[PDB]
Amino acid sequence: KLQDSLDAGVGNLVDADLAKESAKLQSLQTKQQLGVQALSIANQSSSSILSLF
Amino acid sequence: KLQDSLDAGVGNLVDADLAKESAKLQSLQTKQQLGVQALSIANQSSSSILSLF
């Protein structure tokens, strides 16, 4: 029983809660897609003054 | 982040604003043509007295 409690304590110390990580994964993949979109919109900025000349 | 800030500061120091450069270019070309025409009118001044003689 003592080694079982010790292994349970190691698991309580290091183990992660994957169910939170699922939603975190979805939000972060949506966020990186939006960030690539914003990065392209930022890259496009230089062209606007080409029409002024 | 510090390298990005230093590059932004160099750009704030030396970079020009092209959108105003376009308007100054238009006005300067028009002023050039007007100055060339005024120089021609100044060049024509000598001929008037040939009618007097």
Side-chain angles (χ1 to χ4, degrees):
Chain A
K1 292 181 181 179
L2 166 58
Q3 66 182 178
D4 284 345
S5 296
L6 279 168
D7 288 341
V10 161
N12 273 343
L13 283 187
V14 301
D15 278 14
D17 191 327
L18 289 173
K20 292 177 71 68
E21 319 298 359
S22 54
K24 211 190 289 213
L25 182 63
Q26 306 261 36
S27 66
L28 294 175
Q29 65 183 357
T30 300
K31 195 163 149 211
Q32 65 182 357
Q33 274 312 120
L34 279 166
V36 189
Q37 295 297 109
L39 186 43
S40 298
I41 299 168
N43 301 317
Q44 285 159 9
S45 83
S46 72
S47 72
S48 296
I49 62 170
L50 208 57
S51 47
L52 297 158
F53 276 98
Chain B
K1 293 182 183 293
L2 170 45
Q3 184 178 2
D4 271 339
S5 299
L6 294 165
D7 300 326
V10 176
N12 287 333
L13 276 153
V14 287
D15 288 351
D17 186 74
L18 295 195
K20 169 174 325 193
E21 301 313 346
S22 44
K24 293 187 286 185
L25 169 67
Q26 300 273 3
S27 66
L28 276 191
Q29 276 162 9
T30 300
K31 178 165 202 216
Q32 192 179 350
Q33 312 201 225
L34 295 175
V36 176
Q37 297 198 33
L39 183 63
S40 310
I41 300 167
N43 281 350
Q44 293 179 356
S45 178
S46 58
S47 66
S48 313
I49 62 170
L50 279 156
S51 309
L52 299 194
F53 278 98

